[PDB]
Structure 1
Amino acid sequence: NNKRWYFTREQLENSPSRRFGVDPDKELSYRQQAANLLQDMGQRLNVSQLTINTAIVYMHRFYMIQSFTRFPGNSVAPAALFLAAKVEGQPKKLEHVIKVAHTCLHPQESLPDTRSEAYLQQVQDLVILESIILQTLGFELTIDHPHTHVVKCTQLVRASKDLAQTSYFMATNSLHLTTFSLQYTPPVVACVCIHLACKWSNWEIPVSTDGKHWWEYVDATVTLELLDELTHELLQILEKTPNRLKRIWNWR
């Protein structure tokens, strides 16, 4: 149960989407686009990043059971966010989520009439798809995120606004861009984020006077071999993501 929603690399390779016939690279686009849509929608609904991150994780876990061929990201994401809003105590009304999800997906199109059959349908479609997420997830809705374990480190290892906040950014983008959420546990991912944030700022957290590194106070499973490997992975996809690094880039 502790390793139900965490997977090997070969389990991610032969996924439900791979079984139906979706390229490994192509199966990241639909993941990154869902995250991208959840972010767009969530911003407009005025839910917190937390709620969006919960929704992204539901989505990530959802497609470890179901296929993108069977369930389009544009159908699922409004449902997964609708649910995340309620779970995280920022519930948004069904008609509001539909309405918002429409103007993201169809910027030029005006909404259908709320009396119409097409609207009354797509409302019932969201409600139905919410029940299908619940049952896929086994009602395991309490998600722990890496962002909690960022403060455990950054405040207690004592590093500025610029380092503290950069490490959130990495964690937020690790849900958008990677499938780390489905592989390494939240405190491990939090270490990858701070390690990368230290490389990006030319920060050097020292060796504690025991003969000890900072990461052993966050999770004793972690090695440098692993952080160097995963900071490499996360930095690659951030370079490929256009305009994302410019947010954290130093102009002086």
Structure 2
Amino acid sequence: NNKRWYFTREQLENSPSRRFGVDPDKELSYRQQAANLLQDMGQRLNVSQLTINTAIVYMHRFYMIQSFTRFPGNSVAPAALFLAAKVEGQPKKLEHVIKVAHTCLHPQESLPDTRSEAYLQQVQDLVILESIILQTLGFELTIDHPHTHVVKCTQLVRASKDLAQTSYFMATNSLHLTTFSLQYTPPVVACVCIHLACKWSNWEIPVSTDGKHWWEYVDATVTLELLDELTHELLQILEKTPNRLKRIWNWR
């Protein structure tokens, strides 16, 4: 139901991986890494950012049941991407996903003769994994991403073309850089992204005719306390990611 795939902070500490000795700091790294792998591959396979994101969620969720020590990100990522693409009606050929995953993880390696046993095996390997992903997710593959809710909000906040782009930027990055999607509903996360997008650009959106802040019209569970704490967390890790913030920095 609504609570299956959402976790408390305490539950996030007790991840299947922490159970096999993986530091919580390390683990987040494994996550970000996969996300990158997903992003890089997704772009070379020329799928939509939507699918890339759907794959990324599958990944985050997978690793709340499975441990990194038993399923390496470089194995799951291609599998999950292959899947998300099928689900988002942008299906990519199995051979073609294998090929791109190879050159991504082995820019140097020589691609095997598709006739090889060692190649035939790695095809079967991907497929096995995609299956292990389905059964992990209990066949729940309909995702919902903050992005939908971004437009809905930004529009109704009447915010410049630019402000709006920064907001989706925040969205796509919260997926690579944080586990917000495992703790907060797409709608709530969207408010977080827009809040920060405003703080970053010195936009302030004035109080409705009622005294009610914009976000309340997007979700009444949300509060300034929360938004402030969350954007701080998100902004911090952005500051950590080389060149990420450069992308939206008002250079003028």
User: Is TM > 0.5 for Structure 1 vs Structure 2?
Assistant: yes
Superposed CA offset, 1:45-88 (max 9, x none)? 00000000000000000000000000000000000000000000
Aligned length: 252
* CA positional deviation for 1:18: 0.3
Q: CA deviation at 1:128?
A: 0.2
Aligned-pair Cα RMSD in Å: 0.4
- Give distance in 2, aligned partners of 1:118 and 1:28: 32
Q: Mean Cα displacement is larger for which, 150-159 or 18-27?
A: 150-159
Secondary structure of 2:156's counterpart equals coil
User: 1:156 deviation in Å?
Assistant: 1.3
By how many angstroms is 1:211 displaced?
1.3
Shift of 1:190: 0.1
User: How far apart, in 1, do the equivalents of 2:201 and 2:48 lie?
Assistant: 26
The farther-off stretch of 151-160 and 26-35 is 151-160
> TM-score, normalized by length of structure 1?
0.99
TM-score, normalised relative to structure 2: 0.99
Q: CA deviation at 1:110?
A: 1.5
Q: Distance in 2 between matches of 1:138 and 1:71?
A: 18
What is the rounded CA distance, in whole Å, between the counterparts of 1:125 and 1:68 in structure 2?
A: 17
CA deviations 1:175-202 (Å, max 9, x no partner) are: 0000000000000000000000000000
* CA positional deviation for 1:140: 0.5
What secondary structure is seen at the aligned counterpart in 2 of 1:89?
Answer: coil
- Matched with 1:237 is 237
Which whole-Å deviations, capped at 9, do the CAs of 1:205-233 have from their partners, x for residues lacking one?
Answer: 11001111000011110000000000000
C-alpha deviation, 1:161, in angstroms: 1.3
SS at structure 1 position matched to 2:24: coil
Q: Deviations 1:30-59 (Å, cap 9, x if unpaired)?
A: 000000000000000000000000000000
1:93-112 correspondence to structure 2 within 5 Å: 93-112=93-112
1:157 to partner: Cα distance: 1.2
In 1, Cα distance between equivalents of 2:245 and 2:110? 34
> Following the alignment from structure 1 to structure 2, what is the Cα–Cα distance between the partners of residues 86 and 6?
24
Does 2:123 correspond to 1:123? yes
Q: Quote how far apart the aligned CAs of 1:141 are.
A: 0.2
Question: Structure 1 regions of 5+ residues with no counterpart?
Answer: none
1:5 aligned onto 2:5 = yes
| Distance (Å, rounded) in 1 between the aligned partners of 2:42 and 2:161 | 25
Unaligned runs of 5+ in 2: none
1:10 Cα deviation after fit: 0.5
The CA distance in 2 between the partners of 1:32 and 1:224, in whole Å, is 27
Structure 1 moving runs of 4+ over 3 Å: none
* Distance (Å, rounded) in 2 between the aligned partners of 1:132 and 1:16: 16
1:75 aligned residue: 75
- The match for 2:212 is 212
Residue 121 of structure 1 and its aligned partner are, at CA, apart by 0.5
Cα distance in 2 between the residues matched to 1:2 and 1:137: 14
Q: Which residue in 1 is equivalent to 2:45?
A: 45
Identity %: 100
CA–CA distance in 1 between the matches of 2:183 and 2:97?
30
Take 2:75 and 2:176, find their aligned partners in 1: how far apart are those partners? 18
SS in 2 for 1:22: coil
Write the mapping of 1:93-242 to structure 2, written as runs, cut at 5 A: 93-242=93-242
